[PDB]
Amino acid sequence: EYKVVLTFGSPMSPNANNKQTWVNKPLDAPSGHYNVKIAKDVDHYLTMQGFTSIASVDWYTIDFQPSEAPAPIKGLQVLVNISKKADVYAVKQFVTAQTNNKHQVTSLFLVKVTTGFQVNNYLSYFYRASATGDATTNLLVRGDTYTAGISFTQGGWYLLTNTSIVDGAMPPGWVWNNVELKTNTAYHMDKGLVHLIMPLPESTQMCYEMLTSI
Amino acid sequence: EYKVVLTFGSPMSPNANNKQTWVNKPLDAPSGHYNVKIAKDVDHYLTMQGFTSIASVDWYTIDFQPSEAPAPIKGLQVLVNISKKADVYAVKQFVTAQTNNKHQVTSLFLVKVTTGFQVNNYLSYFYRASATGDATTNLLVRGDTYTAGISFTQGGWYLLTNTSIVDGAMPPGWVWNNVELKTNTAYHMDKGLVHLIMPLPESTQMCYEMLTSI
């Protein structure tokens, strides 16, 4: 286990400092294109939603003493179609009980790209309508998608996310349920989503406690 | 200067895990009530907007070595009307250039309450409308306010925020411009706002580099 300090880079196109954060929404992609998947094997993988460039990474022990970067996690891969494009160095899940029967799971993967690539994906964003009075108004994902290209550069660090909503029974450890972003379903905030409302300014630092194994 | 790790408590009423974060919006308060102000003197103060309970604080040097908590910052006060309700232990501003002529300044104050108190304030929340296509849709503050009570407990740590939008010329160091949350004006995200969309789960940790002087 490590304490990991990420220094955020500039937003990845089509994102911008003054725009809503676009994330991949579905479990499919346009014709001729592919999702980015973070996979343990063919039956256990999560589809990339959030994509964020990380300028640098500082590694520490769990009590904050300085450490050299670990080696890649064996047996995890960032895949496009059937080819591995990045190594995974650290992982973390945030599990939130919205209710006992509705859990939100946000998975974060710190990855380093080994073959540069681009994908066209169906993108959307979080939004929240104004409402009158003290009524609850939900954090939602826009239904419509905007098809756009996303580019990943060799040698770059990236932070990838996936958020699932799991109904009913939960498994006991790492959750592999792969669920597209829902529209019409309330999300909560968790520490894995704080960078996905609008891009945080380049040079912003965030600290996470992360694992180097599933 | 310190690296400060905050462990978030439960949301403060009227907030909840499943609700938008309510923040104080204006520079005034209902009849018979008062804003919370974080003041250096009568001509230099910021009005509380965000209010968040912090369960615990861990203090480190700038390179992450463990440290005892500092003493309160002399000459800063958390005031209600004309009475000091809390000591300020650490401060930080995030300054964002939306454009060269529109800067966003988010100030964070880590405080410990010394006399418990309650205020009724005019509250609002951040929202973002759905829009079609790849149009930018702004992060805004709802115009309408909801009047509600906010309670602060003796001995508790709290994180207070203020965000200003400054038009034109900027001062060179700590910005004392006190500006209510605007409606109809785009906000960006900064590291001081990441906990103010919806409450982060109790026990979430966030790390900040903070000062113990202005």
Numbering used by the authors:
A (entry chain A), B (entry chain A): 431 to 644
Structure paper excerpt:
HAstV particles display T=3 icosahedral symmetry formed by 180 copies of the capsid protein (CP), which undergoes proteolytic maturation to generate infectious HAstV particles. The AstV CP is composed of several domains, including a highly basic N-terminal domain, a core domain, a spike domain, and a C-terminal acidic domain. To further explore the structural features of the AstV CP, we determined the crystal structures of the HAstV-1 CP core and spike domains to 2.60-Å and 0.95-Å resolutions, respectively.
The HAstV-1 CP spike exhibited an apparent molecular mass of ∼50 kDa as examined by gel filtration chromatography, consistent with dimer formation. One noteworthy difference was an unexpected disulfide bond formed at the interface between the two protomers of the HAstV-1 CP spike dimer, despite the presence of reducing agents throughout protein purification. We mapped these sites in the context of our immature and mature HAstV models and found that the P site lies on the most outward side of the virus and is exposed in both immature and mature HAstV.
